[PDB]
Each structure stands twice: as C-alpha cells, then as structure tokens.
C-alpha cells in the first residue's frame, strides 16, 4: 500500500477508514520470548499446522522457579514430551511485541509536505519480560533421539556427487556440434515469426489514393512513411509519388522526418 | 565445407546447416562458385591433383562418424565401409545421396551383427526418414551376398540368415 | 610394402603410402615399425 506522508490536507480521513494511531490497550499482556530447537521450531512455525489446537501444558514449580513443558502425545513419538524451559533473563526490559496490519484503503522550521510515509495498522500485542530457551530434559526416554538427530545434522550430506555418463562416449556426442539433428525447439525463433508476415500492396489508382491521403491528412496533419503505409497499404514508391505531389516532409522541426500536408492544402 | 573436403575429413551439408543457418539453394550456388574460382586459381597458380577430394559422394568418410554417433563397435563400422564401397556397383541405389547410402549400409550391418538398435533410433539420430532407411534395407536385401564382407561370414562372426526378410 | 605392428594387437601389418595409419584388426591409431631384418653386431664388452 503505497502512500504519501506529511498530509496537511487531512486526506487520511477520506482514504483510511481505520485510525492510524497505534492501539495500546493490549500492551499489558505478558509475553515470554521463547527460543526453540530445530525440530520444535519446525513443527511450531509452519502455517499449515497451528489450528488453535493444544500443544501441551506448562508446569511452574515455585520451589526453584522450575518451568517445564509437558507436550501432548498427538504430534510425534520420536521427540520428547518434557522440556526444561531455562530463563536466560528473569527480567527483560524495553522489549515489546507489536503487530503490523494493512489498512482499509478503499473508502530549523522549514518543512516539505512530502516525507513518503507508509502507514500501517499497528498495535502493541504485549510486553516481554521472560526470555526463555527450550532444552529437552536429560532423563526423557526420547532425549537420545534428539542427540541422534543433532548428530545426524552434521553427518548427512545435502549435496550429491556429479553424475558420470555411463553410455558410450560417441552417443553423448551425437547431439553436439557436428550433428544431423536440427533444432526442433521454437526458442527465440524471431526469423520464423517475422518472415511469415508479408504486407503486399496493389496499385489501386491515383485519384482514389490521393483522396485517401487527403482523408488521412484531415484525420492527422503529420504522418510517418510507415504509419501512412500501414494505414493505406500502398507501395512506398507509389505512396512517395503521391506524397511529394500532395504533401511535404519536415527536415528540421520538432516533427522532422514526417510527411505533412502542403500549406496550400492545409487551409482546406 | 571446402576445407572439410580438402583434408579428407568432409562433413555433409546438413552438418554445416546445423551450425550455420544458411539457405540451401544459395548455399549450393555459393559452393559451386567457390569450386569454380578455386579451380581457376589452381590452374592460374600451382596445380593440385584432386585425387577424389572434391568428390560429391565421399560416402566412405561418413561411415566412421555415423557409427560413432550410434555407438557401434569397430567391426560393424568396417563392415559398413565395405558394404558402402560395394553399394556403388549396385545401380538401383547408385543415385541415392551418400548420407542415405551410408545410413542404410550401417543399418544393414546393425541387423547383421544383432546390434540392438531400432531403425527408429537410427532415424532419430541421423535424420534419415525411417521409411527411407526401411526402403533402402528392403532394396539392399536382394543383394545380400555381394554387400556383406566374405571373410566375415567365412570366420562366422556374422551369418546371412540374421537379416530379417521383407 | 613396409611392415608395421599395432600397439596392442601385435599383428603384423603392411602399409603403403596411400593407406591411413590404422590397425585393420584393432583400429588403434598407434603403429610400430617392424624390427630390421638385417643382423646387428653388438660388441660384448
Ligand atoms: Zn591392432
């Protein structure tokens, strides 16, 4: 949504139904900034999932402020279901969560009334006080699965080797350079699509072509050779043999290299 | 094309047309003019014996390249060269283009050596029409005895009954 | 005319000047000239 800022015309009343001011009443919601491992962030950030379903329970034990995640069994069995939430920052300051939303575009002292502001509907969703990281519990039966997965992260290769052609070497050179095989592809066949067009123009007679030229000069005073020729479908020799008699070309003006009507006929 | 013919290494018109988008009629006119003025320069300057270097057919020089393109063994290539050499004696195909003569000799020896390549694959590789290759094989089936190398069927590497009939 | 031997087939071949230098049995384009028929004297010191 491209828009112009520094509007002293109060155009935002007419072009934006929603208010441009930041909504601030949700800023008191407590937000925990949680960092996730690869598997859990993969299964918790994809948009095809996350239909509002329950993903687990949080147990906060006041004896030592131990915060644990108790995931449900519906997702997987290889991943653990008990995670130790470590608080890397008990108190987090000056960290807020704000939203971005598209608007309703339908219905010294020196200043410049143009600053190129892109307005968006914004609101503080909440305030961040607890920075968290998720580590799986050591005693979980599926923790060794996570250790094996992290070892397999650096073990497997995502790149395959170069493919070596196993057939006879002359068969590979059947298509290369010296080849009977003409290109059946239609890629960049400019000559094929340009030589198929043929503009052929008969010698229809002098009085009719000059009447047609006068009608076209009544339509527009200045004409190019190509434009007039494609408008009348006449050969360039005959068209020139009429145009020099009935008109003239411009050599120096702003409309140069254009055939325009003679000034004897311009008044008519 | 003149340079290829001069070094006994001649390619065909379709090869150079595969490189250069050249119109065939004026290509032939240009080649004829260049041959005329080259013979004139040879007569005016140093004289060169042609000894079959400007030959129109040159069908013996197309067999190894086409056999390489089809990935054929060597003995199929030499048998095809012998066949195409003896195809000149046959008057029924003496007027055919050397490309088609080489292709039908190669296909005859492919069928002779039980090389598992169809006529459609040869036609796709070398752009001789499969009808043309089939007709050439049919018209060379009557002259099986002369075309096939005698010492090959003497040594038993190939036999004349391997060729399918028409 | 002159005797030649292919590089790996080791079959004796006779080549004239107009013949291309290839093996009739191998097609290997490296040929070795045959050893001379004349006797060669080596002083055994
Ligand atoms: Zn050899």
From Swiss-Prot, chain A:
<keyword id="KW-0547">Nucleotide-binding</keyword>
<feature type="modified residue" description="Phosphoserine">
    <location>
        <position position="19"/>
    </location>
</feature>
<comment type="subunit">
    <text>TFIIF is composed of three different subunits: TFG1/RAP74, TFG2/RAP30 and TAF14.</text>
</comment>
<dbReference type="GO" id="GO:0006367">
    <property type="term" value="P:transcription initiation at RNA polymerase II promoter"/>
</dbReference>
<dbReference type="GO" id="GO:0051123">
    <property type="term" value="P:RNA polymerase II preinitiation complex assembly"/>
</dbReference>
<dbReference type="GO" id="GO:0000166">
    <property type="term" value="F:nucleotide binding"/>
</dbReference>
<keyword id="KW-0238">DNA-binding</keyword>
<dbReference type="GO" id="GO:0003677">
    <property type="term" value="F:DNA binding"/>
</dbReference>
<protein>
    <recommendedName>
        <fullName>Transcription initiation factor IIF subunit beta</fullName>
    </recommendedName>
</protein>
<dbReference type="GO" id="GO:0005674">
    <property type="term" value="C:transcription factor TFIIF complex"/>
</dbReference>
<comment type="similarity">
    <text>Belongs to the TFIIF beta subunit family.</text>
</comment>
<dbReference type="GO" id="GO:0005634">
    <property type="term" value="C:nucleus"/>
</dbReference>
<feature type="compositionally biased region" description="Acidic residues">
    <location>
        <begin position="1"/>
        <end position="10"/>
    </location>
</feature>
<dbReference type="GO" id="GO:0001174">
    <property type="term" value="P:transcriptional start site selection at RNA polymerase II promoter"/>
</dbReference>
<dbReference type="GO" id="GO:0006355">
    <property type="term" value="P:regulation of DNA-templated transcription"/>
</dbReference>
Curated annotation (Swiss-Prot), chain B:
<comment type="function">
    <text>General factor that plays a major role in the activation of eukaryotic genes transcribed by RNA polymerase II.</text>
</comment>
<protein>
    <recommendedName>
        <fullName>Transcription initiation factor IIB</fullName>
    </recommendedName>
</protein>
<feature type="repeat" description="2">
    <location>
        <begin position="66"/>
        <end position="142"/>
    </location>
</feature>
<comment type="similarity">
    <text>Belongs to the TFIIB family.</text>
</comment>
<comment type="subunit">
    <text>Associates with TFIID-IIA (DA complex) to form TFIID-IIA-IIB (DAB-complex) which is then recognized by polymerase II.</text>
</comment>
UniProtKB/Swiss-Prot annotation, chain C:
<feature type="binding site">
    <location>
        <position position="9"/>
    </location>
    <ligand>
        <name>Zn(2+)</name>
    </ligand>
</feature>
<protein>
    <recommendedName>
        <fullName>DNA-directed RNA polymerases I, II, and III subunit RPABC4</fullName>
    </recommendedName>
</protein>
<dbReference type="GO" id="GO:0003677">
    <property type="term" value="F:DNA binding"/>
</dbReference>
<dbReference type="GO" id="GO:0005654">
    <property type="term" value="C:nucleoplasm"/>
</dbReference>
<dbReference type="GO" id="GO:0042254">
    <property type="term" value="P:ribosome biogenesis"/>
</dbReference>
<dbReference type="GO" id="GO:0005665">
    <property type="term" value="C:RNA polymerase II, core complex"/>
</dbReference>
<keyword id="KW-0862">Zinc</keyword>
<dbReference type="GO" id="GO:0001172">
    <property type="term" value="P:RNA-templated transcription"/>
</dbReference>
<dbReference type="GO" id="GO:0006366">
    <property type="term" value="P:transcription by RNA polymerase II"/>
</dbReference>
<dbReference type="GO" id="GO:0005777">
    <property type="term" value="C:peroxisome"/>
</dbReference>
<dbReference type="GO" id="GO:0005736">
    <property type="term" value="C:RNA polymerase I complex"/>
</dbReference>
<feature type="binding site">
    <location>
        <position position="23"/>
    </location>
    <ligand>
        <name>Zn(2+)</name>
    </ligand>
</feature>
<comment type="subunit">
    <text>Component of the RNA polymerase I (Pol I), RNA polymerase II (Pol II) and RNA polymerase III (Pol III) complexes. Component of the RNA polymerase I (Pol I) complex consisting of 14 subunits: RPA135, RPA190, RPC40, RPA14, RPB5, RPO26, RPA43, RPB8, RPA12, RPB10, RPC19, RPC10, RPA49 and RPA34. The complex is composed of a horseshoe-shaped core containing ten subunits (RPA135, RPA190, RPB5, RPO26, RPB8, RPB10, RPC10, RPA12, RPC19 and RPC40) where RPA135 and RPA190 form the DNA-binding cleft.</text>
</comment>
<keyword id="KW-0863">Zinc-finger</keyword>
<dbReference type="GO" id="GO:0003899">
    <property type="term" value="F:DNA-directed RNA polymerase activity"/>
</dbReference>
